[PDB]
């Protein structure tokens, strides 16, 4: 008797100042080196986060494809999310590593953060 979801476990990649970014993963059925990550950004605060831009880097052996995001606004009070697809190419199947760069306005400040994603599960690259 085991209760874990079948497939690639989801993670909270970042959570700070009321911004929360979740990652869910889909391994391609046809291409063992391709992993599709859908990001959901949420805002648990009382003010909207505007002009949201999610960017990311991977190591040189990898390749990245960022598709366009559903929106620029992370609504206040958790009334919606921003969705963005990113595809990761890992031809050598090495340990997945990602640095994210976030940029947005909130509470009358231009917000910046740069942070490493530390909790990729082994099934997102193995
Ligand atoms: Cl987590």
UniProtKB/Swiss-Prot annotation:
Domain of life (superkingdom): Eukaryota
Gene this protein is translated from: Ap1g1
Organism of this sequence: Mus musculus (Mouse)
Span covered, complete protein: 697 to 822 of 822
Impact after mutating residue 66 to E: Strongly reduces interaction with EPS15 and SYNRG
Localization per Swiss-Prot or TrEMBL: Golgi apparatus; Cytoplasmic vesicle, Clathrin-coated vesicle membrane; Cytoplasm; Cytoplasm, Perinuclear region
Protein's name in the database: AP-1 complex subunit gamma-1
Subunit structure: Adaptor protein complex 1 (AP-1) is a heterotetramer composed of two large adaptins (gamma-type subunit AP1G1 and beta-type subunit AP1B1), a medium adaptin (mu-type subunit AP1M1 or AP1M2) and a small adaptin (sigma-type subunit AP1S1 or AP1S2 or AP1S3). Interacts (via GAE domain) with RABEP1. Interacts with EPS15. Interacts with SYNRG/gamma-synergin. Interacts (via GAE domain) with AP1AR (via coiled-coil domain). Interacts with CLN3 (via dileucine motif); this interaction facilitates lysosomal targeting.
Family as reported in the entry's similarity comment: Belongs to the adaptor complexes large subunit family.
Chain ranges of the GAE domain: 6-121
Described purpose of this protein according to its UniProt entry: Subunit of clathrin-associated adaptor protein complex 1 that plays a role in protein sorting in the late-Golgi/trans-Golgi network (TGN) and/or endosomes. The AP complexes mediate both the recruitment of clathrin to membranes and the recognition of sorting signals within the cytosolic tails of transmembrane cargo molecules.
Tissue occurrence: Widely expressed.
């Amino acid at each position: 008797f085991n209760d874990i979801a079948p497939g690639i476990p989801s993670i909270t990649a970042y959570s700070k100042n009321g911004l929360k970014i979740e990652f869910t993963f889909e391994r391609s059925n046809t291409n063992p080196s391709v992993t599709v990550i859908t990001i959901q950004a949420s805002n648990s605060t009382e003010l909207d986060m505007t002009d949201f831009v999610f960017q990311a880097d991977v190591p040189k052996t990898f390749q990245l494809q960022l598709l366009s995001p559903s929106s620029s606004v992370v609504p206040a009070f958790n009334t919606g999310t921003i969705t963005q697809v990113i595809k990761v190419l890992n031809p050598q199947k090495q340990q997945l590593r990602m640095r994210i760069k976030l940029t947005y306005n909130h509470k009358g400040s231009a917000m910046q953060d740069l942070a490493e994603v530390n909790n990729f599960p082994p099934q997102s690259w193995q």
